[PDB]
Design a binder for this molecule. Structure first.
Ligand SMILES: [Mn+2]
Lengths: 255, 257
C-alpha cells in the first residue's frame, strides 16, 4: 500500500517533463526536412534496452503486444481499440456523461508513434530549425511516453498485493474467457475520478506552461489540445492495459 | 533586405529562449542523476554525425573561428571561455546604485564554459536509481545542441549587422594603430546593447519563475534551479553570442575596401 503511493507520485512525475518537452519542440520552430527519418536513425544509434524484468516480459505472449518494431521504445506502437464516437465532447461537462472520457475516437491516430508524428507533420516545413535540437527533443519525448506507461507494470504488482482477493476471484474464475478476464481486470483497475484528477491537472499545466510572455511567438494552433489528447487518448488507457496485462501475467500468485 | 534579414535572425535567436528554459526544467523536474549519466551523454554525442553548415564548418577552420571548436565529440562553442569581467561580490539580478541591473559575463567563481556549467549543475543532483536513463540522457543531449545552435546564430547576425552599420565597424577595422585584441574589444563594445540585454534577461527571469510552479503533490525542483536558468543566459549565452559576432566581423574585414 505504501509501495503504491510512492509509485503514484513517480507516475505523476512524468507529467511536467512530458508537457515541457512538447512545448520546447513546439516553440523551437517548424518541421525539419527528413526529421522523421533522422529520429529513427538517432533511436537506432542510441538504443536503451529496457530493464531485465521488462525485457523478459516483452518476450512473453502477454508482453509482446507492447514490444514495438525496432528501433522504437516499448509501447509506442500499441493500438487501443476505438471506444468513443467521432463527436464525443472531450473536455467539457456533458449531462449524464461526466467529463474527460478516455480512449480513442475513430479519427485519432492509432498509436503514440503516429500521434506524435501527426503533430510534427502539422507544422510548416522549416529550413531554419536546427536538426540536432529538433531530433533530440523528439527522441526525448518518445522515451518519456514509453517510461510513463511502463510504470503500469510495477503499479499493477503493487495493486495486486493490495487487493489480492478482488483480482484472484477473477483470475481463478474458470467460466470466463481470456477476453472477459482482461476486461474485468480492466474495470477493477479503472478509476474515472482519478482520471479526471490527472486530466484536469494536465489541462491546467498545459495552460500555465504555454503562457506567452511579452513579445513571445505564439505556439502553433491546437498545441494545448494535443497535449491533453496525448494523456487522455493514449497515456492513460495504455497504462491501464499494461497494468491489466501485468496482473494476468502474475496469475500464479492466486494459488 | 538587410534590415529584414536581421529581423528574421533576431526572431530565430528568440525562438531558442523558451526551448532552452523548458528543456532545463523538464530535466530538473524528471528526477536525480543516473549512474554513468555524464559518460552516456558524451558517448551519445560520439555516435551522431551531425555537422555544422558549410559556412560554419569553414569558419570553424579559420584562425578567427577555430577558438569556438570544441574537443570532440562536443558541439561548437560549448567549451569557449569568456574572460572574467565581474567581481566576486557583483550583484546579478537587482538594481544597484550607479551600476544598473543584470551585468553580463563571468565572475571568478563561475565555471569557465557551458560544458562545465551544465556538468556541474548535473553533479549537484542526488544520484537516482529510478530516473529513466534514456530520457535523462536525451534531454541532456537536447540542451547541449540547443545552447550551441543558439550562440552560433551570432555568425549570420554579425554579417547582417555589418551589411547595415558598415561605417562604424570599418572605422575600427581600418585603424592600423589598433592591435587585433584592441579591435576585437572595440567591436564587442560596438555590438553591445545593454538595454536589449536587460529586456531578454528580465523576460528569462520571469519565465523561469512562471514556468516552475508546482501543483499539488508535484515533486519540487532542485534548489537554485531558477537562478541557474538565469545564469546560463547572463554569464554564457549572451556574452558568447557577442564574442562569436565580433569574431565574424573581424573575419569579414575584406569588405571595408
Ligand atoms: Mn569521439
Amino acid at each position: 500500500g505504501d509501495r503504491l503511493d510512492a509509485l503514484r507520485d513517480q507516475l505523476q512525475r512524468y507529467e511536467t517533463p512530458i508537457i515541457q518537452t512538447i512545448l520546447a519542440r513546439s516553440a523551437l520552430g517548424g518541421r525539419a526536412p527528413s526529421e522523421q527519418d533522422e529520429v529513427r536513425a538517432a533511436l537506432s544509434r542510441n538504443a536503451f534496452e529496457p530493464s531485465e524484468v521488462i525485457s523478459e516480459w516483452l518476450q512473453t505472449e502477454s508482453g509482446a503486444r507492447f514490444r514495438s518494431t525496432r528501433p522504437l521504445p516499448p509501447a509506442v506502437e500499441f493500438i487501443t481499440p476505438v471506444v468513443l464516437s467521432r463527436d464525443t465532447v472531450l473536455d467539457k461537462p456533458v449531462v449524464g456523461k461526466g467529463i474527460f472520457p478516455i480512449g480513442r475516437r475513430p479519427q485519432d491516430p492509432t498509436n503514440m508513434d503516429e500521434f506524435l508524428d501527426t503533430s510534427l507533420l502539422s507544422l510548416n516545413q522549416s529550413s531554419t530549425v536546427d536538426l540536432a535540437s529538433a531530433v533530440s527533443l523528439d527522441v526525448s519525448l518518445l522515451h518519456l511516453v514509453s517510461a510513463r506507461v511502463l510504470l503500469g507494470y510495477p503499479i499493477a504488482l503493487a495493486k495486486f498485493d493490495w487487493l489480492h482477493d478482488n483480482f484472484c476471484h477473477i483470475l481463478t474464475n474458470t467460466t470466463l474467457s481470456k477476453s472477459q478476464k482482461l476486461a474485468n481486470i480492466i474495470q477493477q483497475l479503472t478509476d474515472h475520478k482519478q482520471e479526471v484528477n490527472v486530466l484536469s491537472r494536465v489541462e491546467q499545466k498545459s495552460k500555465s506552461l504555454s503562457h506567452l510572455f511579452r513579445n513571445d511567438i505564439p505556439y502553433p494552433p491546437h498545441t494545448q489540445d494535443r497535449i491533453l489528447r496525448l494523456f487522455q487518448a493514449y497515456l492513460i488507457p495504455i497504462t491501464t492495459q499494461i497494468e491489466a496485462a501485468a496482473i494476468l501475467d502474475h496469475a500464479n500468485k492466486c494459488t
